[PDB]
Design a protein around this ligand. Sequence first.
Ligand SMILES: [Mg+2]
Ligand SMILES: [Mg+2]
Ligand SMILES: [Mg+2]
Ligand SMILES: [Mg+2]
Ligand SMILES: [Mg+2]
Ligand SMILES: [Mg+2]
Ligand SMILES: [Mg+2]
Ligand SMILES: [Mg+2]
Ligand SMILES: [Mg+2]
Ligand SMILES: [Mg+2]
Ligand SMILES: [Mg+2]
Ligand SMILES: [Mg+2]
Ligand SMILES: [Mg+2]
Ligand SMILES: [Mg+2]
Ligand SMILES: [Mg+2]
Ligand SMILES: [Mg+2]
Ligand SMILES: [Mg+2]
Ligand SMILES: [Mg+2]
Ligand SMILES: [Mg+2]
Ligand SMILES: [Mg+2]
Ligand SMILES: [Zn+2]
Lengths: 58, 213, 146, 174, 37
Amino acid sequence: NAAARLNDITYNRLIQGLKAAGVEVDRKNLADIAISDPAAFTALVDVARAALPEDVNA
Amino acid sequence: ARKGILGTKLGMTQVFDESNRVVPVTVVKAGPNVVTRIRTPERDGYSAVQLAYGEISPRKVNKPLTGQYTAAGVNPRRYLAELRLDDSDAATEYQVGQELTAEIFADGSYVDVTGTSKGKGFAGTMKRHGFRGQGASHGAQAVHRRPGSIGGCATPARVFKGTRMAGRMGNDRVTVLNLLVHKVDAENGVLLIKGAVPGRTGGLVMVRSAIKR
Amino acid sequence: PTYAPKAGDTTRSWYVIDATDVVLGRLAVAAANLLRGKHKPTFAPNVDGGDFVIVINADKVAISGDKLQHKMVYRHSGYPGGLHKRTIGELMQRHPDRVVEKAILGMLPKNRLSRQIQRKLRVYAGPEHPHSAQQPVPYELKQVAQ
Amino acid sequence: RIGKQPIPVPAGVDVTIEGQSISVKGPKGTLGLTVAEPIKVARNDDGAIVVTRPDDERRNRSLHGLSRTLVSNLVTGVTQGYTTKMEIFGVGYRVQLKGSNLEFALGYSHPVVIEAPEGITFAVQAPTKFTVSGIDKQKVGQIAANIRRLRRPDPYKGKGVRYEGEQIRRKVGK
Amino acid sequence: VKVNPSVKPICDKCRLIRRHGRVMVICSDPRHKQRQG
RNA sequence: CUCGAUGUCGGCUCGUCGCAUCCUGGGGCUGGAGCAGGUCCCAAGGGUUGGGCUGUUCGCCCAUUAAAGCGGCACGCGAGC
RNA sequence: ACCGCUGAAAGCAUCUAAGCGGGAAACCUUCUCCAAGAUCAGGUUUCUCACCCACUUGGUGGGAUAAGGCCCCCCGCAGA
Ligand SMILES: [Mg+2]
Ligand SMILES: [Mg+2]
Ligand SMILES: [Mg+2]
Ligand SMILES: [Mg+2]
Ligand SMILES: [Mg+2]
Ligand SMILES: [Mg+2]
Ligand SMILES: [Mg+2]
Ligand SMILES: [Mg+2]
Ligand SMILES: [Mg+2]
Ligand SMILES: [Mg+2]
Ligand SMILES: [Mg+2]
Ligand SMILES: [Mg+2]
Ligand SMILES: [Mg+2]
Ligand SMILES: [Mg+2]
Ligand SMILES: [Mg+2]
Ligand SMILES: [Mg+2]
Ligand SMILES: [Mg+2]
Ligand SMILES: [Mg+2]
Ligand SMILES: [Mg+2]
Ligand SMILES: [Mg+2]
Ligand SMILES: [Zn+2]
């Protein structure tokens, strides 16, 4: 959640977008990535944001 | 506009006034005081003036205190105290090295005298708080001066803070209000104050003009 | 194993929050999170991460009038009948920084580590603070859109 | 139906608008005022005062009348100041003009003196008749009420301080 | 000022108002004025 | 709940709290002329006596007082009497 | 508590919804006392302001001092 909000997105929508993109990276490895490779975490954020639907409230 | 002076309690006597009434007076030796320091708002946050009183041998004063006195350029004294003025400092009516004497008061005025009451040692409840004690007969068993109950029951299962009990008594700082200055003797520098002054003979006493009058 | 912060790993920064019109609860939550370090991915509940927080203009915080008139602040001295109450209005008249500090401290975890965490909090009533030697970057409350 | 009415302007010497604030001048002094945010005060073709507000809202309709009446009272006072005529009833009851203050004799041991506040003028016409004048209606009314409550109500004999021509209650008593 | 949980006008001149969150009845007759409490 | 024990009235001593206020403080109304009252509202800072009779609490009475309030705390308080 | 001034919604009225007053032994300052263990451990001042040895050279172990203090000693109306 800390890393996601650093990249300007909520944990809610980050998880939903990763599920939509079909990325099955674990939460443990997601946190490890967040601490170790911030650039990789940012790339994952862009992927999830793209996979998110156009309007999440419909 | 508070005035103040340090002095020594010399003891009690009696005198007669113009209406031929006896006046019990306490004689206070409001000795000559030196200031040695001024507390300014811009430098300390409050207004006050130090007062030095009491002849002492220079051999008996350690180096730090000697340096403090040297900075103000006065001879060391025994006692040192501050007279807390009001916020209206006015930065005047007091110069370092000024001498105060007993003529800052006048006959018929009113003063406040503060001192340290005499020590009473470890004191019981009857003496310290005026407890009634228990009876001396009619069956009372070894409770003639004992406090009795000190609480309730399971509600509450404790003793409250500040409950009156036996302990050390006296040696407190005490101030007495609205004491009439019967007469000020300028030659010997004493004040004849009507009433009782806290402490023992020879104790240090601070005299101030009464706030309430 | 998951990362566990070591001694010397943590880094601290200085933040200055202007409370000129922020709601008291909002400002308190933001300051508490900043102090604890929940904004960092290296956060660990047993480690005092987090940054120094300076609050200025504490007298200008936003409180409703009925709250100023009716919200009580209680204290017990320990003596019988030792309960003393003041309104938030009087508290803001006298020590405005204390209202903010009490709000922030009510939001930290109730343990020993919070005692060391809250040492990084400085609240001032005016618009000036003495810590110009440090360079507190301004911080504004933001909400990430969901 | 008050508030949807323009305010006539006899003089309006220095009518200004600055962020829901107005000031006026004329034959008397100037008094500033700040208008409520939802209500807007505007100038018209002949410089009249009109109060506007977003319609259909309780808090706005309530404030409309207040905003109109405040400015109308302001201009009325600047044109001619408000004056209150009050009389004194009771045996031996009377008032005296002592410089700028008024001295009252209402049966008390001590002499009752009322100090004139700033901007308020006192005038005594008769021993039992006197006037309070001024520009601000609220201040004039407050001082008039203060002077009126100098004595407790007396329904049996009517002694006290009264406004001119008002009816106080009466009781038979004995 | 009569103080009862039920306040209602007694004569035709009594006005029922609500001020400072208080339901109270005012009238020219002083013995008619009441407030809720 | 307590039976391999939770000491039961009254009194003394020490208290503390509530306000449903006895006095003192502030008011409204009055079938309040004044003095005095009645009733209702606000108010718990302080104060609120000594005896006779009874194991008593309670109660009656005597003499005062500004007043002689009502209750909770194991019907407060027996490793305090 | 209560008594008001200005005043609409509700063309009037209204102590009130904007606003502004008075108002008690109750509350807060003011008088007395405690108080920086207030670990946010404060302020104003003044004095010393100085050495030597060892070592793995360490915000390391020792030793000798300054200012100052304590113990010992003669006492107290200070006191278990
Ligand atoms: Mg005895
Ligand atoms: Mg016995
Ligand atoms: Mg025995
Ligand atoms: Mg015996
Ligand atoms: Mg308990
Ligand atoms: Mg049993
Ligand atoms: Mg058995
Ligand atoms: Mg057992
Ligand atoms: Mg009791
Ligand atoms: Mg009550
Ligand atoms: Mg009669
Ligand atoms: Mg009455
Ligand atoms: Mg009381
Ligand atoms: Mg008080
Ligand atoms: Mg019992
Ligand atoms: Mg026993
Ligand atoms: Mg017991
Ligand atoms: Mg018993
Ligand atoms: Mg026991
Ligand atoms: Mg009116
Ligand atoms: Zn009526």
